[PDB]
Enzyme design. Sequence first.
Site, mmCIF file in Angstrom:
data_model
loop_
_atom_site.group_PDB
_atom_site.id
_atom_site.type_symbol
_atom_site.label_atom_id
_atom_site.label_comp_id
_atom_site.label_asym_id
_atom_site.label_seq_id
_atom_site.Cartn_x
_atom_site.Cartn_y
_atom_site.Cartn_z
ATOM 1 N N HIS A 105 38.093 66.224 55.515
ATOM 2 C CA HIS A 105 36.766 65.734 54.695
ATOM 3 C C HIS A 105 35.443 66.569 54.841
ATOM 4 O O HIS A 105 35.244 66.910 53.785
ATOM 5 C CB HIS A 105 36.835 64.257 55.469
ATOM 6 N N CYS A 141 33.757 60.512 62.505
ATOM 7 C CA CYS A 141 32.637 60.945 61.792
ATOM 8 C C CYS A 141 32.658 59.928 60.684
ATOM 9 O O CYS A 141 31.476 59.067 60.176
ATOM 10 C CB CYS A 141 32.569 62.335 61.032
ATOM 11 N N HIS A 142 33.927 59.767 59.962
ATOM 12 C CA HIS A 142 33.893 58.910 58.770
ATOM 13 C C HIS A 142 35.166 57.994 59.029
ATOM 14 O O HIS A 142 35.377 57.170 57.885
ATOM 15 C CB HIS A 142 34.203 59.364 57.497
ATOM 16 N N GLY A 143 36.298 57.906 59.883
ATOM 17 C CA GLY A 143 37.339 57.421 60.328
ATOM 18 C C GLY A 143 38.234 57.970 59.458
ATOM 19 O O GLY A 143 39.140 57.073 58.891
ATOM 20 N N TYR A 158 22.805 58.965 52.715
ATOM 21 C CA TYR A 158 24.253 59.024 53.509
ATOM 22 C C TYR A 158 25.066 58.008 53.148
ATOM 23 O O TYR A 158 26.221 57.874 53.124
ATOM 24 C CB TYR A 158 23.700 59.287 54.919
#
Lengths: 179, 179, 24, 24, 256, 256, 428, 428
Positions: free
Chosen positions: A123, A143-145, G300
Amino acid sequence: GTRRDFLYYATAGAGAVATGAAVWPLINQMNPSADVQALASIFVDVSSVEPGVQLTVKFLGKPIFIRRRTEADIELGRSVQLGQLVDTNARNANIDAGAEATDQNRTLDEAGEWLVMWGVCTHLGCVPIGGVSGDFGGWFCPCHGSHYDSAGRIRKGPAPENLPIPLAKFIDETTIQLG
Amino acid sequence: GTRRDFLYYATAGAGAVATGAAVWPLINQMNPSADVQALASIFVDVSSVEPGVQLTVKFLGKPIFIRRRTEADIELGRSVQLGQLVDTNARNANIDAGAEATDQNRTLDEAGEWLVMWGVCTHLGCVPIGGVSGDFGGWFCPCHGSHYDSAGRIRKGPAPENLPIPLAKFIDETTIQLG
Amino acid sequence: WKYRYRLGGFASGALLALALAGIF
Amino acid sequence: WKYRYRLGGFASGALLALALAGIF
Amino acid sequence: AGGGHVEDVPFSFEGPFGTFDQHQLQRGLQVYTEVCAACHGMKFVPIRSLSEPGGPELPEDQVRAYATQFTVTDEETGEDREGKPTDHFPHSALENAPDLSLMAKARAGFHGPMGTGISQLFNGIGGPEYIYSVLTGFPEEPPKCAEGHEPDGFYYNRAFQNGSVPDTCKDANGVKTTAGSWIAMPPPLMDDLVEYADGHDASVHAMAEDVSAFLMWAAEPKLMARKQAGFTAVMFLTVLSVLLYLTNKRLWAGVK
Amino acid sequence: AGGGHVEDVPFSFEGPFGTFDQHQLQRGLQVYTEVCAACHGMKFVPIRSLSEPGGPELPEDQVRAYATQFTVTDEETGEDREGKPTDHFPHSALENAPDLSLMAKARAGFHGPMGTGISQLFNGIGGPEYIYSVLTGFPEEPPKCAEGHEPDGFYYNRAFQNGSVPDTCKDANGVKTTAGSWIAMPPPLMDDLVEYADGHDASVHAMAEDVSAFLMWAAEPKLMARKQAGFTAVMFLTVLSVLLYLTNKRLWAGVK
Amino acid sequence: GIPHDHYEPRTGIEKWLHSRLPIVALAYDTIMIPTPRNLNWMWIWGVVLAFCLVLQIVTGIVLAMHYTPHVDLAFASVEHIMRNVNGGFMLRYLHANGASLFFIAVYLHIFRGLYYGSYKAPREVTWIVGMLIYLAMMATAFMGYVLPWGQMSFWGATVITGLFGAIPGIGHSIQTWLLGGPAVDNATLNRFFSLHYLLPFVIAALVAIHIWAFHSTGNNNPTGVEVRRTSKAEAQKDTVPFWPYFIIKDVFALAVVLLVFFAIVGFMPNYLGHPDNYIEANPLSTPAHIVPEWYFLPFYAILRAFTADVWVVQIANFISFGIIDAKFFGVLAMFGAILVMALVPWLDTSPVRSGRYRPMFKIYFWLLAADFVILTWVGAQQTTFPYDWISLIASAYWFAYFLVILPILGAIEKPVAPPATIEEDFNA
Amino acid sequence: GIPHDHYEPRTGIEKWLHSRLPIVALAYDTIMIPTPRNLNWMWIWGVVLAFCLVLQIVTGIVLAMHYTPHVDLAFASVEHIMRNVNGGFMLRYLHANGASLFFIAVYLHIFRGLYYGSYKAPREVTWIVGMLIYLAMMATAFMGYVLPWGQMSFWGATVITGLFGAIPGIGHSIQTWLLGGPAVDNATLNRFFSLHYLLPFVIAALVAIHIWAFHSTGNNNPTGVEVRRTSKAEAQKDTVPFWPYFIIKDVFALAVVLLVFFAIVGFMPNYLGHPDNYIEANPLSTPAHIVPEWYFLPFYAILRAFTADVWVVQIANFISFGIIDAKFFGVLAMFGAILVMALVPWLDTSPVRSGRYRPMFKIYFWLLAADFVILTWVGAQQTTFPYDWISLIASAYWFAYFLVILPILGAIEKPVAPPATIEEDFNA
Ligand code: HEC
Ligand code: HEM
Ligand code: HEM
Ligand code: HEM
Ligand code: HEM
Ligand SMILES: C[C@@]1(c2ccc(Oc3ccccc3)nc2)OC(=O)N(Nc2ccccc2)C1=O
Ligand SMILES: C[C@@]1(c2ccc(Oc3ccccc3)nc2)OC(=O)N(Nc2ccccc2)C1=O
């Protein structure tokens, strides 16, 4: 016009060529330098690695994962079918680019015991937490899963592709050559 | 406008005080830091130093010369009276500030055998060259052609003062505590 | 004496800042 | 074609620079 | 990971009028030297800072004697020698033990209520509280779910929230049921482990509080100077703002 | 000190069209490895540059083998290991032997005519010719003034100038009478001290010329790139200058 | 073009200098520009932003005298500044919190512009210059945050460079060029330090252009009615000179803001930071939860909102034959948020300038304000339920405000009449 | 105030932009200034200096992306630039020789100003701004030369810091403040790097002020006769627009200068340097023959000229009760050279502007030029006989030119009549 314009535009063209010739180095100096591009392979001594333990090593600035998979990890890995996978490409530099993402194409040995892969989430480049984490008994990126399986394949999350496998090979019983 | 001027100029004064309070740290941060100011004395071993050989050490980021004066150097240094010296002050930090630049007051021992000194030209900071250089059997600063006597006293050139001597002492038989 | 308030005001304003700033 | 000299001059001037620079 | 629960401690350096307790910092230095320093190190902390104002403020000779207990490789000659006050504390002797220089600022003991950050606003970051909770967060018996499945070489800690957890103590959703987690560090503190000269009690609570205070000082050795500068600036700007308010009112009275 | 005499050598790299003789650089590399490396080092020259174009241009396998002979203390770990091509040449093994990486650019070979810098303007800086003059500048016997007054541990060299000089060789007002001075380096080159690959002449003058060329490349590897870039930029600015001239001429044709 | 008096030398030195360099005349015209009498406290943020720029430049200049842009020395150099150099702790905390002050001021500035129609004609150039300034500020803060070389610095740089690496085709090349290697390393840190030094001066030049642009058209006011240019008397009847009337007002506002800022810096300097940045950068391990700074959290969040499951993402993937994937779609959305913010002068088609006289524009503007706050809050959360849905809705409303709501309101709205003049507003 | 046409928006976008920001009008007025049509080739050095500033800034920004300002890494980082980074050798040589190009250009610029009276009224402000620029350039070059951290860098920093420390009473404090410690060390290198980055932007701002000043006063010409302001036609008969005529002339001159500069850079980069700067700095040993750069040699010579045995030095020592010694006298003389160079606009009392019509001034100016070259040559030589006398005489003449010769010539000289107009000179 017939000659008035020709001279002025020729001068402008020569000036533009000189300006571009001067500008290009200012940009090209930011590319990787000779020292960076000279970084060659490394050799890792996996003499002391029981099943279940991952060995994280710095290489080209990033972490490389070398995990000796256990009985169950390899069972789970070889049980998943190519259709259930989000990404069916093995993303492996050793075998051919067209190779399919079967568990036997994600490891270095035919036994599927040694898994060597860039520990770099596809990613945005974080390091997934290993040691059996996530929902697929593999690696979890916080970080984002992103969830990876016991073979290092993407199963759920923002990550587009599987974790890449470097040009890697066993040089002896206890030594691997990365890159 | 009595009250008007009073208020306006009081505001201006408070603003000036705040401006100065903000400005002073900007200048002050360029002064030596606690790391630099904390540098303390060092110890130099002179067990393997023979007559006529100089030892250059680093202290406070500058060279310090420790020289075992030979018999010829001792004889030469003691001959010159105060008349021909450029400056009378010994400039030795280990004795009274008003002492004259006698060879006895330029050395750490009563026999004048030892000479601990700053190897920094008093003109603009260059390093005088040893080896009985110059026209007086001592040191020679080549940056601007200054000459220093065998005892380090200035004899010719633009240097306004003798080479200073820092705090020093023989704690042991073959050790000198610089600083 | 020609500039009591212009001069005295400036000093008084400065002193109030410095005098109080040293309270802590 | 209306700008044959303007267009031809710019390219010709650029080529004369690059073409000669590669003669070392 | 997530945010754990830390027992709030009334440290002497809390609030605008907070000041390090010199004796407490000296006790913290003692217990750091005799317990924590074996595995840990503080690479960013000069030893000479022990003598600086607003800290332990030990005498210069005592600090110079203290620095002699370390063997340091000289930068000039690359040879081992006795330490000097100009040298920082040694690195971590044990690899898997981070630097304690900035630990009191590298951890947030207070989180929530729902990510808004209101808790930290009224309670601070809570790094010292986190350290205190970690040191005293080792129970005698582990959780009942983990019994028979404890990781080898790890110990349960009620305050630690980044270690592994046995599969038994996890839930169906995959979250750990236990409040704590398994850390790789045995219980360091123990009753009467360090003999304080001044007679202050050496219980785990008192020792942990002392270590937390000392590590807070190490992280930010110029906290009191920072607070004094903040007060000075605030008062300058307060006087200036009142004067500017009066000036603006007087000026705009003409046109209003 | 000062700047004295030197032997003008027609090095191939001298001149706008000068280029390194790849074989000469390989010979110089051999002489450096077998002789100079015993005391000197080149801490700034990466070993991999022995295969970079415009230099000795060895096959990368040969370079890798050459690099293996050096022991190196790994930048991270700390334990010694074999040298990789990514590593630099080692430091000077001998304390007072200067590093030869930039020696060919750190020395002036000509001085004059009267401090007008014209000689350098027409002959170059002269680094390689000064190195050649130092290697080949050790005479058979010292000057007559020094027989029985030589500093112990030094040797007379015609081209060295920053060395001590026996009192017997200075005149009445401090000026030395000898061409050269006393250097601390023993004469390192002796006839046929090296056996070359192609059986090339291996006299002192040959080894000195070869090692000078090699040290010139070691100091400035991108000299041939520098001169290609120069010629290019010159040709471009030349074309542009001509065009801008004709433009300015036709533009001012109307006013005047 | 507001009529007013011009500079007139009176003393000898002024007459001497005027004939040689009319710099005093330029300064006089700059500080004596007539400005509306009815400006409220939301116009004070320009002076706050100017002070923030100057403070950041000065603090950075003093800090750079002690900081070493080297991976083996950057963290150590920052701790040396904190501990050893006298006053260094205060200077570093000032430079760290100055970014937060700068961005809170800039967001207040931007939202005042959005409410009062200060972006409308003839003030499009000022808005565009401001948008360029904001992009420069974002880049400067990003590259500054990497210099300490902590964990957050390292992994924020990693993520931000991965964003560029996500571009199809040329993305890998651009990422390698911007990194100077396979990953963030010493080359990245050094080039970032150089460009972090460079950019603030570019921001200063752009701010000078900003000042000139808003001097040319004039100053907008809450009423939205331009100053009367018919004659000098009427112009003075709607305006007052900037000096002293608004100089002192803005200076007082800045003094109060600085009181609060210095209290924050002195008693909680690292409330707005992250503890993880006090850990030396570790390329082999990532923090369990990386969080950007609060001033980047909204965008973000917009980046995180659009995952593979979203219908618009799937449509984009299908139309592009797979070229636009979820990651690149998220990057495009993050940049397109700032894009739609940029060209608002041409999307808002309502003739009336000030939003105070637009009865239903107020509702959507305050919804947008709440939405920006919600994006800030949800950026720091995980992408699990219910955070993903609220993040998606927040991003959708952010885009719909500029792309859908404003053009429609330009047609269907029924605004109320503004006052005849600024004089009428100021006298009531 | 030369009459001429004004900008007129032609196309639609130009009309749109003019009403919002007249940047195009400002650019038009800048490039269309009527300049005299009789300017000779000595007026081309302003464009050369502008290019030199831009080149120095660009190349330095490039270099700073790879250079580490740390004593243990600075020399290694410069070698890394030379060897490893793409084209880094060319960039380093360009930045190194650009200083030499910049300083030869400013010396030619300054001596043109001295010859043609461009400093005279109403152009004093331009001269003062130029002197400030020159001081900034000197400081910038000093710090830049210190940054490589070779032998010459270290010992030049030592010498300059010692000169600062020669000041009575406050000298030691100022030296310690500039050094940040007992001697030249890492703090000095780091702060010098920071200020070397800072200063060129200050130079750019000063150059903008320079440009504005000379635009306000109008360009000077060899005849010294001002353009006719009576009417537009007469002004046109004395001038041509700067664009295209002088734009192209100056660009051609810059192209030739760059041809020579690139030939030098590509075939002898190290001619203008010193080999000793390729030796790592050694605090414990000094080079036997330290020499400044050629552009500092004349003032270094002026510093060295006045020794303890000079009569004026002894008089200064006696009058000051020993406060002013030989060292501080030399420092004062070195700075007073710049002081008289700055104060020339008020020392030259002659009414006639150009030196072309001043028979004695020609002789004395060419003597001054020869003297400047002689100072440059003798700065690099040792102080032994006869160089001490040569340096003393050269410095004495340098001071006598401004302090003695020019005021006297303003009274006793008998100039010749200049042309009636610039038109008369051009048509001949
Ligand atoms: C030890 C046995 C040496 C070997 C083999 C070589 N060199 Fe040397 N070198 C040595 C010393 C002790 C010194 C310093 C001498 C001094 O008086 O300071 C040097 C110095 C040089 C120099 C610099 C000379 C100068 O004027 O600065 C050069 C150019 C040099 N050496 C060259 C050189 C070459 C090419 C060698 C291999 C053929 C070589 N040296 C071998 C010690 C030793
Ligand atoms: C450091 C950055 C900035 C500074 C120093 C700055 C400064 C100023 C100043 C001094 C003014 C005059 C009126 C006032 O003070 O309110 C102003 C007006 C304005 N600014 Fe900015 N600004 C900055 C950034 C921005 C940005 C990022 C935007 C929009 C994205 C913006 C948009 C505007 C607008 C629309 C106006 C109104 C001008 C007018 O009414 O004529 N500014 N700014
Ligand atoms: C608009 C202008 C600027 C902004 C918004 C800005 C912002 C920032 C931020 C947010 C940081 C991170 C601080 C931290 O995490 O501790 C930082 C660090 C830093 N900045 Fe800047 N900066 C600006 C200008 C400058 C300038 C002009 C310089 C140099 C002259 C500079 C030098 C530094 C340095 C050396 C650091 C690292 C030291 C530290 O962490 O404090 N900055 N900057
Ligand atoms: C970066 C440094 C400088 C730059 C870029 C620069 C540029 C220029 C330019 C473009 C001009 C217009 C005419 C011409 O080109 O000759 C000019 C004129 C002039 N410059 Fe400079 N200059 C610099 C430094 C200096 C210095 C150091 C001085 C004096 C000490 C100086 C004194 C003058 C004078 C007297 C004029 C004549 C103006 C007039 O006749 O109205 N300049 N300069
Ligand atoms: C008027 C503008 C400038 C002048 C006259 C100038 C001059 C110099 C000089 C003479 C050197 C010594 C080069 C050498 O001995 O090899 C140098 C080095 C250096 N300068 Fe500048 N400089 C200027 C602007 C800048 C700027 C704007 C930067 C960065 C933003 C910069 C960065 C550097 C660096 C990193 C070095 C050391 C690397 C090297 O040696 O080339 N300079 N400069
Ligand atoms: C200050 C900050 C920042 C600010 C602004 C910012 O905008 C940009 C957006 C696109 C391109 C360039 C800049 N990009 C980073 O820099 C930084 O590393 N983080 N942390 C962080 C941590 C995890 C993910 C992302 C960022 C920040 O929040
Ligand atoms: C380029 C140079 C320089 C230029 C200009 C310069 O002016 C200044 C003069 C006074 C105050 C401040 C700056 N001061 C150094 O920088 C440098 O270190 N040297 N070497 C060198 C060697 C010996 C003595 C002096 C200098 C230079 O010649």
